[PDB]
Amino acid sequence: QRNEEKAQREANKKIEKQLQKDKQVYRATHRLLLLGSGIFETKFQVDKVNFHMFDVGAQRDERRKWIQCFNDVTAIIFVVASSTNRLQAALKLFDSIWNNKWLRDTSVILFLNKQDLLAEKVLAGKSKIEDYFPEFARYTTPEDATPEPGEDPRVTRAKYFIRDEFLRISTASGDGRHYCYPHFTENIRRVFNDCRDIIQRMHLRQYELL
């Protein structure tokens, strides 16, 4: 009858108000994926812009199926512990995240963690970096590289070499669709600046200005 359709339509109308009000909250927030009980949302808000990062803990080490949920995050935060070789173990995971079909528009913010650990490693005589990467033995620190102080050219060698590995994966494919932003671990300001930079490049791509 027509009265129950009217009641159903007024319920549709009062549901559409909440979906209109939820679209405003959902488009405002930036979804991150921290990829250093099965998910740990950590909402944080810098400069009134709402982020909520998702640290996928209590999951198995087999990520080819739940990583497709995160194809519409603004950024994958990729914390790599620069020291089994667990630096090539993150090189290969970045190689598969970068070239994945669904994460091919999803940009990556790359945090090269533990640079003080790498410093006290490389100055002490525990240079495994030349044993596991012999291309470092012919490497030269670039001229567009900043040796900010507390750094002799043996830690800014290995540090920029390790981001050159990731920017060698990153600049093979994925020219305009997604971007890798390498950083050396204020840490939240870098995520915010690079998410602003991701969102700006998405908008500039929607106008063919980039």
Place this chain on the structure above:
Amino acid sequence: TASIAQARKLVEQLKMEANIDRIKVSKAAADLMAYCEAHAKEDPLLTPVPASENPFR
């Protein structure tokens, strides 16, 4: 070790899946064909009903 015990439980599960009967695939295939010809009238996506008793118009 415990991995050998897990392999023993696996091979016992594979022993459970060995004493079952497997019919000829022609009989099961003819059962599927019999199902598709038996329910051939009451499936509107294959054989569309007229748009009178169709709720999506």
Place this chain on the structure above:
Amino acid sequence: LDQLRQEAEQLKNQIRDARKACADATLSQITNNIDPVGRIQMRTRRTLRGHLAKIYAMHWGTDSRLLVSASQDGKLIIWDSYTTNKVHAIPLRSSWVMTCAYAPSGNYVACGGLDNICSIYNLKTREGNVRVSRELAGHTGYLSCCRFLDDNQIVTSSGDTTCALWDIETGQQTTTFTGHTGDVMSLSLAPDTRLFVSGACDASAKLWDVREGMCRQTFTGHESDINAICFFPNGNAFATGSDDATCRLFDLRADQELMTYSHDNIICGITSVSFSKSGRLLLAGYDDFNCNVWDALKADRAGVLAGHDNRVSCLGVTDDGMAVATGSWDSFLKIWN
């Protein structure tokens, strides 16, 4: 030790001989004389819009007019598909919803995902205010599929290589079906709901039973992960669709593949499989953004749905075969008829 693996190899070799001994014909060989199926023209009747992110699962009510759909925005919208009216819109605690279910009675709705908890919601609670009836925790990985057997039982597949039969009124795992070595990506309950099939990332499917809890059968043949599984409407066959871009029809008593729905131009995997009421159309969503409609017996694609702007994540036919809803990653549910 190592010779135990050799004895298991000889046992599965005996299984292979016992399965090719019962295979002398095909499903294609008997069906050279059956009638063909025409180009299945399905126009999008309704387009349910109202989801903000990618719809990861939809599910039909058993009255075949109410459908729940979960999307990754954190929202579980119950739609009247006959009027495109939203009946409910449950906000969820975790936004990463990889599955949804509708209770066959119509009272509850499950959801679950990367939070590892199945949330069961009462739709007809006191006067209508959809609250969480039961949060079922106990899974160690993400929930991939959940399918109510009764109002009181659910079975949830997870990415901890394990399916589990729960009890909604008590909140604890009645049965725990182990045996997969990969993430169980899907499950499909039989029309009798006594057995259920469950395909996983190890390219294998497994037929269980909710009463005992041990694995009745195991189905190899796929090359990569089984993204989707669905039962033929008699409960004797089931179609698996995997990420090697094939569908395959495995029969239980035949214990092996009856047909393989592939194509040369098709390269991306089947996200969703569904059958018609007759089982004559195997609709299969794809990562090339269109649901091909395969003639299940002849194995030649009858139609293509082809309306979706993104990956067709979910695809469900009604109980009475009257319509077929395909949700997709473009956040639109399309009703095809």
Place this chain on the structure above:
Amino acid sequence: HAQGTFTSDKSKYLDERAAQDFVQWLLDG
């Protein structure tokens, strides 16, 4: 703007022309 100008210039080029044409109408008629 451009069409204010153009049209102003057009309209008065034609109104002055109509004034001279009216004066030519008075000489014979």
Place this chain on the structure above:
Amino acid sequence: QVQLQESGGGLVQPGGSLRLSCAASGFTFSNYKMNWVRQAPGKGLEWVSDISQSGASISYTGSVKGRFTISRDNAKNTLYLQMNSLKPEDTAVYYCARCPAPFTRDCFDVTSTTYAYRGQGTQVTV
């Protein structure tokens, strides 16, 4: 059933040579990027070297770079790891893996603890 049957692994002094081969049945070998995953006695699973569908996209760890040379022959459904000048840090169980999806540039979960499409592994000992 996806079957990876590794073979050719034995014992040799440092500076020797072995030629591993994983006979791969159950899948179309040409559509998949293959892999070599070694597992040390004291550690987890280290990727060694991948090779794409054609056999011209080859990568390695630097621990094996200049010393090992993979090749696949798509007709015989085979994948080789020619080993040369072995070190005592190269003794491991060499699983020949296979990234799951076909025609994909990504190669996920190959060195995971319970990966499915990985073989049983030749123990190479020096």
Place this chain on the structure above:
Amino acid sequence: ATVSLWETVQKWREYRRQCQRSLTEDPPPATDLFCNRTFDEYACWPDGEPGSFVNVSCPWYLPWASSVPQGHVYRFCTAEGLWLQKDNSSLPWRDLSECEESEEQLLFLYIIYTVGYALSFSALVIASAILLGFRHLHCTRNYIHLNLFASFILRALSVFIKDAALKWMYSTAAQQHQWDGLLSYQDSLSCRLVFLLMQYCVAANYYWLLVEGVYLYTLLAFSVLSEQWIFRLYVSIGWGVPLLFVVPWGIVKYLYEDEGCWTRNSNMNYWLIIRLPILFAIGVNFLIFVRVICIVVSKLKADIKCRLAKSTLTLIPLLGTHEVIFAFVMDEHARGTLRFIKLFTELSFTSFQGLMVAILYCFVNNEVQLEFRKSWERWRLE
């Protein structure tokens, strides 16, 4: 300013009445076979002339009367009973060399912008049919594009109706009714309404270019805002603020200075109240242009020059920054050989602007080409 036609007809009618009141004042004509008093509808002659060369020597209603104050024309009647006659003529002779004045450029400018507005209006109804008929392009960016394209189409329509009304204001049938005295089209309020519609459609075009620039700047520099509140604000700026400075122009041009229809601009302050909001949309679009191009050259530094040039030549039509080069020329001060070329690099540019934003932001747009590819692909499987 310069004289009107309606002013000339009113001056002629009052001169005609005033000199008919003196034509029958006092007749002296006691001469034999000489000319009498008459009015030739151009200049009234003396009441009696016995053969002397005395005329009024110029009438004072005519447009260029203040240019020539001199007279004494030697045009009198002879002793034949009537004036002297010319070569095969029955009209009284009079010399008209003493009261006489001293174009294709307007036709050339008109052809260019008419071709441009027709090509633009065609491309923009095709672009609106595309942006309204795909349902995957239906984002808020394309709603701001669609209102921009509708502002362009309203601009092209108002430009066509304006030129048609200028053809109807000074047609020979309209001039015939106007120097008969009453009831012209130039009196009718539909003339005033099409010349009020032209200004509103121009201002709505400039303010939808401003809304496009403001929207792009809030997308880049600012945060995410609520889509419906920002779209209700954008339609109110693009369609309502043009009313907010057109309705003052309408009422001021109606009551203060209503010379002719509202087509020529006598008082330049009253046209400044419609120019300065348009100059304000132009200025804010130039600020947004240089800020977005700085954002692009900062994004491109992370050849560079050939991609930046393509992005700049893509951004120039969308915001209307090709007006900035000649917006400050200020056609009060542009008179001469600049006033032509200014009009050229105004008019043509704005006309073909509707073409350029339809090629760039619909046809060679990658999302629209994607929708055409998928539509032809899902027709090919049929």
